[PDB]
């Protein structure tokens, strides 16, 4: 299983690796899949690259 | 935050309902973000549509 | 330019034909880009495959 | 609904913000969906990261 | 590395199995990365879910 | 046809130039589609943005 998470940029390296760890675990439990097969890729977006209603985020 | 999770087809609706929730909870936790802003998208793949080494899954 | 649009399933082919045309025009228009270079691909998601707060839509 | 737009880098911040506004509106009309539920995320690609026929763009 | 290939629907399982192997090897080849680390996922699109120039494919 | 390739950063431009050309050709053959219609986009991921076992890559 492969997860691509899209988030707003600005966060520390501290949280984003925890995210990888926390999300990978949730996939493994939910789908009874071995953790070693779970992939997480994070993509960050700049202020001018994210919209919520036609307006910037 | 937006999570697109790619999984092999074969799971029950029950399992996939758990996946969305557990992953959503993990994301809210990891990024101290309000849960109500978290979105999850599941995409299922048939075995003949997924490869691991050039070989099917 | 390539647009991947993620929507809940349930619309008619007509609405999706309108979506492709109207979104394509806006991209060509917004980026002063040739319309003929614009690609749009729609991905529909079943009700049990989309989350908003860890819960279904 | 969630729209992912993949574009070549080099354009100004002014053009990319208009895109979010205009693409969002197009989605809202085409699918008779409330505008505030529409999300847009822009991804730019360096010239050496985009192909049209096996050749760079 | 993860490859997501977006194609028009209508092709045989034979062609898509050929696609996965040939594309995986090309990636493993280009980047001197283990073939066994290569993942490929295919997503097919119906006539009414793909646009070029705002018109259906 | 569109290929989205997700790779870890650190490789040279010549390798990625090879990748786009080489991968584009593989898709064209496999699906007997004109090469000039094949498009490829590469997305690179930093050390802290990729997970494989819940641990960084």
Author numbering:
A (entry chain B), B (entry chain A), C (entry chain D), D (entry chain C), E (entry chain F), F (entry chain E): 1 to 57
What do the study's own words say?
The enzyme 4-oxalocrotonate tautomerase (4-OT) is composed of six identical subunits of only 62 amino acid residues each. It belongs to the tautomerase superfamily, a group of homologous proteins that share a unique catalytic amino-terminal proline (Pro-1) and a characteristic β-α-β structural fold. 4-OT takes part in a catabolic pathway for aromatic hydrocarbons in Pseudomonas putida mt-2, where it catalyses the tautomerization of 2-hydroxymuconate (1) to yield 2-oxohex-3-enedioate (2). Inspired by the versatile success of proline and its derivatives as organocatalysts, we anticipated and found the proline-based enzyme 4-OT to promiscuously catalyse carbon–carbon bond-forming reactions such as aldolizations and Michael-type additions.
To obtain insight into the structural consequences of the M45Y and F50A mutations, we determined crystal structures of mutant M45Y/F50A in an unliganded state and in complex with substrate trans-β-nitrostyrene (5a) at 2.7 and 2.3 Å resolution, respectively. In the structure of mutant M45Y/F50A, the side chain of Tyr-45 is rotated away from Pro-1 towards the back of the active site, where it forms a hydrogen bond with His-6. In conclusion, our results reveal that the two mutations (M45Y and F50A) unexpectedly created a new substrate-binding pocket. This active-site remodelling is most probably responsible for the observed differences in activity and enantioselectivity between mutant and wild-type 4-OT. The progress curves of these reactions demonstrate that this mutant, in addition to inverted enantioselectivity, also has significantly enhanced ‘Michaelase' activity for the addition of 3 to 5a, as well as 4 to 5a when compared with wild-type 4-OT.
